């Protein structure tokens, strides 16, 4: 129908940016229209948002300046827009100290109508932003190296005691520490790395090996033991990590002797710096002044709390307490409850006024969901979710994904927020914020019918007459199954008095495609057909995937607006194969309503998965046809020639008068005495009445002159008194290839013909 498929503009393929969603934007103060696209983070492009313009019959893109810059993997980008500015939300990962779990929420930035920063928001530590009274307006870890002494001066009983001590210590530390690994070294005469950090990953093997080591005996070369621990462990070649803390536990008996290395220089050496030194004394023979001072040198600077004389089994309380971690409750395990850590605020967004925004919190409270009504200028928000009266209700509402999609509805003199919960029960639902007083909560108003159809994943209010009050609400079920994943869309009519929803129609895609995904993307495209009524577009990105060549696939369906509501069938179907080669998932994002070609006519953008397309909108022409007969009536038994004057006119103001019909040609034909078995009159020239081709001149009027002759043969007097019917049918012959100007198109909802009656003089007293 109205969209010019023959002249698309496409972002360069394979080059930057790799489009994910596209939307048209316009600054109300300057009337510039840009095309905002969002791309995932890549080495070429760091930015998540780009503004593109039409230059040299292509779409060139330049990144926007002050938007958040994602780091690492792609975790989500969301860009909505209204006449109050552009909102961009990025998902981020954060790790708190000594936390064995991560946080996943959004950092957002609000920009003005002209793409200048206005607000920044981080949604970590949500507790300090929340304001439960806010009025809702409705109009590496640690490594521990052990230095076991079995170097003579140690009886089998004391050695066995030491082995039990070390084994119990290892087990205890593995229980109270998660990311704490171990290494060991026996240094009796020789030095022998009994086990290494890589083996520490298998706890059972290391524990079994601890009991399986045998005394080596000989002489106590403790300083050499330290130097060996530093030349073999803590070194990244054997598995150590530079970031992790470093501890040591020295089970020496104090009888150092025959040490090839100097103790004092080894202990204080720069390499030793940065590693703790816990010293345990073995044997009763540690009561000499020299041995005591040796221990004191070995142990950390605050000798108390590090130096010891007996194997007390809780002497290592300090690390056992300092290194304690916290675990967020996960699948099948106990832990800290999931309240807001994985809230993913900003998953869906919506701009309400100059300050306030609406955000989706799909992951809040064990994936129950919700939404945050954030006030950007005051930096205070209010969380809104479904009420739970008992534990059963709370556990029943989990994993509903409320806040997956958010929208707003304009009633006569009020507002109403709604949300999508595609996983609700198991078929989906749409909620509405039923403010009752101080408390406002989401209560379900619409429910899907099929499991896994993801009802409520897409919302799309439509104000057909553009009066400021929503008249319909489109709700999509992209994965609906009949033979494959066809999709299905539901149109709901909002009562003008109660605000209730009543099903009106169920839109389905073109028959013959079992893998369409009809309804995955939906948008109100403003007014395209120049009729002052809003038109809508639905997207079916999987249409034609794999079948036949499969070079391109996807579809977009244009539905027009009527005073009654949406149409019954689509007025256009744009197939990706006819648009350009290589388009994949054509129709997973759409926008419109803003002029980007330079005429006064709103245009449209359809974003594939990696490219964006832009289509002009053609001018819709409405032809008024009149004719003057001569003589005004048919005299009884007339035999003269009838003179005919036929004049068309452009009753449509969609085009300047001094452009006529462009390169479109008017093709009209005449039918004489329609409906009569034998025609009373006839045309004087077959050429002048069949396939008559004319070129519209400058202006809004065209005219012609024709002649009619009496039909041959005996008079068919049977129905003389009835008015004679003359019919005119017309079309447009629009050129073939790409054109500089979008050629006009006849209106699809006005009959392309007219019938004029010529009375026949009566035989009564009064002829007419």
């Amino acid at each position: 129908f109205n969209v010019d498929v023959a002249r698309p503009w496409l972002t360069p393929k394979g080059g930057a940016p790799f489009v994910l969603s596209s939307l048209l934007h316009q600054d109300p103060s300057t009337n510039q229209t840009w095309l905002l696209v969002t791309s995932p983070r890549t080495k070429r492009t760091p930015g998540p948002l780009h503004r593109c313009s039409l230059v040299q019959d292509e779409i060139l893109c330049h990144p926007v300046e002050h938007v958040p810059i994602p780091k690492g993997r792609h975790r989500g980008v969301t860009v909505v827009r209204s006449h109050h500015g552009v909102l961009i939300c990025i998902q981020v990962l954060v790790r708190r100290p000594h936390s064995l779990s991560s946080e996943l929420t959004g950092t957002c930035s609000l920009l003005g109508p002209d793409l200048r920063p206005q607000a920044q928001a981080n949604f970590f530590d949500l507790e300090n932003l929340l304001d439960p009274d806010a009025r809702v307006d409705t109009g590496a870890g640690t490594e521990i190296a052990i230095i076991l002494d079995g170097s003579g001066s140690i009886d089998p009983p004391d050695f066995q005691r030491a082995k039990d001590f070390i084994s119990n210590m290892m087990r205890n530390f593995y229980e109270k520490c998660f990311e704490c690994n171990f290494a060991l070294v026996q240094y009796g005469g020789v030095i022998q790395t009994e086990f290494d950090l890589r083996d520490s990953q298998d706890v059972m093997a290391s524990l079994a090996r601890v009991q399986n080591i045998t005394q080596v005996g000989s002489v106590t070369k403790t300083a050499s033991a330290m130097q060996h621990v530093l030349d073999s462990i803590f070194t990244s070649s054997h598995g150590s990590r530079r970031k992790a803390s470093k501890v040591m536990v020295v089970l020496t008996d104090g009888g150092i002797f025959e040490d090839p290395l100097n103790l004092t220089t080894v202990i204080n050496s720069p390499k030793m710096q940065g590693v703790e030194r816990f010293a345990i004394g073995v044997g009763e023979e540690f009561k000499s002044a020299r041995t005591a001072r040796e221990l004191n040198l070995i142990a950390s600077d605050p000798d108390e709390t590090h130096a010891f004389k007996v194997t007390n089994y809780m002497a290592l309380d300090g690390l056992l307490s300092k290194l304690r971690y916290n675990i967020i409750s996960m699948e099948g395990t106990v832990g800290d409850a999931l309240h807001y850590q994985l809230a993913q605020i900003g998953f869906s967004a919506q701009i309400l006024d100059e300050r306030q925004v609406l955000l989706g919190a799909v992951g809040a409270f064990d994936w129950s969901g919700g939404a945050l009504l954030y006030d950007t200028r005051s930096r205070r928000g209010r969380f809104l979710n479904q009420t739970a009266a008992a534990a059963a209700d709370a556990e029943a509402a989990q994993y509903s994904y409320l806040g997956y999609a958010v929208a707003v509805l304009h009633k006569t003199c009020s507002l109403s927020y709604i949300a999508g919960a595609p996983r609700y029960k198991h078929h989906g639902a749409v909620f509405e914020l039923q403010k009752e007083g101080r408390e406002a909560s989401f209560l379900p108003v619409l429910e899907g019918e099929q499991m896994g159809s993801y009802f409520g994943s897409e919302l799309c209010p439509v104000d057909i007459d553009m009066d400021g009050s929503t008249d319909f609400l489109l709700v999509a079920a992209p994965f609906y199954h009949v033979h494959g994943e066809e999709g299905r869309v539901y149109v709901y009519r909002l009562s003008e008095q109660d605000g209730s929803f009543s099903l009106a129609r169920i839109l389905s895609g073109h028959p013959g495609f079992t893998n369409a995904r009809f309804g995955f993307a939906m948008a109100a495209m403003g007014d395209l057909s120049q009729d002052k009524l809003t038109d809508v577009a639905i997207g079916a990105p999987l249409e034609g995937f794999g079948a036949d060549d499969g070079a391109s696939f996807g579809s977009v369906y244009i539905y027009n607006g009527h005073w009654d509501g949406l149409s019954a069938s689509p007025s256009q179907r744009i197939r990706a194969s006819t648009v350009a080669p290589g388009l994949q998932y054509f129709g997973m994002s759409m926008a419109g309503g803003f002029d980007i070609s330079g005429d006064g006519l709103a245009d449209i953008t359809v974003g594939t998965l990696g490219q964006a397309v832009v289509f002009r909108s053609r001018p819709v022409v409405r032809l008024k046809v009149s004719m003057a007969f001569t003589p005004s009536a048919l005299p009884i038994g007339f035999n003269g020639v009838v003179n005919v004057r036929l004049c068309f006119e452009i009753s449509s103001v969609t085009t300047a008068s001094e452009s006529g019909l462009r390169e479109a040609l008017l093709n009209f034909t005449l039918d004489v005495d329609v409906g009569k078995q034998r025609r009373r009159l006839q045309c004087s020239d077959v050429r002048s009445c069949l396939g008559c081709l004319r070129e519209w001149s400058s202006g809004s009027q065209l005219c012609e002159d024709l002649l009619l002759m009496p039909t041959e043969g005996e008079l068919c007097e049977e129905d003389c008194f009835s008015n004679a019917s003359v019919k005119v049918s017309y079309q447009l012959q629009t050129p073939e290839g790409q054109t500089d100007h979008p050629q006009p198109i006849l209106d699809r909802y006005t009959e392309p013909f007219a019938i004029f009656q010529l009375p026949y003089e009566k035989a009564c007293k009064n002829k007419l």
Partner: antibody
């Protein structure tokens, strides 16, 4: 009535750039295309240069003048400009702006008076 | 690349009150398959003046052009402009031009000269 005027002849040194002008009157400027064409002396004929739509500022260029020409439209003053970059002695010729026919197709329905460009040291 | 034009002859020796015939031919077809109009234009230039539009589509004259000019030129690949009776004002050069596809190209021109 539709008519176009230009700045007139110019003399520039080799390597400089000239910004010709084509003021338009008698019609809505943000509507109709402006086409440029150069008639090289010595009987070399004519060759179409480029195109620009004042409403959207979009352009399209013949490959031969892709980096040589650069068209722009000043909707406020209703004046169209072409910039010739890194001129040489060869570029000396007479250049014309144009106005497409409203109905049908005729790239140059109206022409400007003429403007001659001479590059010499 | 581009469509080539073979506008010939380079010049005609003519006398006032005689017929004329230019012959411009294109390397490709101009007949637009939808509007069925051949996309070719004719221009006229006199010495020291900018050219003028004579015939926009293959056979359609512009307002103000005297009737003695006829576009003829059917087929879509070969075209002929015929001047009925040459006159002193008609002395000049005529160029044919492609209109269907980019880049737009001209025919080189054909100049008239009075015989003597």
């Amino acid at each position: 009535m539709v008519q176009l005027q230009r700045a007139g002849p110019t003399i520039v040194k080799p390597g400089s750039a000239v910004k010709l002008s084509c003021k338009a009157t008698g019609f809505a400027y943000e509507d109709y295309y402006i086409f440029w064409v150069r008639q090289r002396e010595g009987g070399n004929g004519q060759k179409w240069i480029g195109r620009i739509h004042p409403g959207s500022g979009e352009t399209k260029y013949n490959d031969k003048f892709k980096g040589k020409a650069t068209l722009t439209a000043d909707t406020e003053a209703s004046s169209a400009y072409m910039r010739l970059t890194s001129l040489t002695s060869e570029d000396t010729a007479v250049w014309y702006c144009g106005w497409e026919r409203s109905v049908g197709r005729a790239t140059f329905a109206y022409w400007g008076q003429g403007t001659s460009v001479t590059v010499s040291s | 690349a581009a469509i080539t034009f073979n506008l010939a002859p380079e010049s005609l020796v003519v006398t006032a009150g005689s017929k004329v015939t230019f012959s411009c031919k294109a390397s490709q077809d101009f007949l637009n398959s939808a509007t069925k109009r051949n996309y070719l234009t004719w221009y006229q230039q006199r010495d020291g003046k900018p050219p003028k539009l004579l015939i926009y589509w293959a056979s359609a004259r512009l307002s103000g052009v005297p009737a003695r000019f006829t576009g003829s030129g059917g087929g879509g690949t070969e075209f002929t402009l015929t001047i009925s009776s040459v006159k002193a004002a008609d002395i000049g050069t005529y160029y044919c031009r492609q209109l269907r596809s980019r880049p737009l190209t001209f025919g080189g021109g054909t100049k008239l000269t009075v015989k003597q």
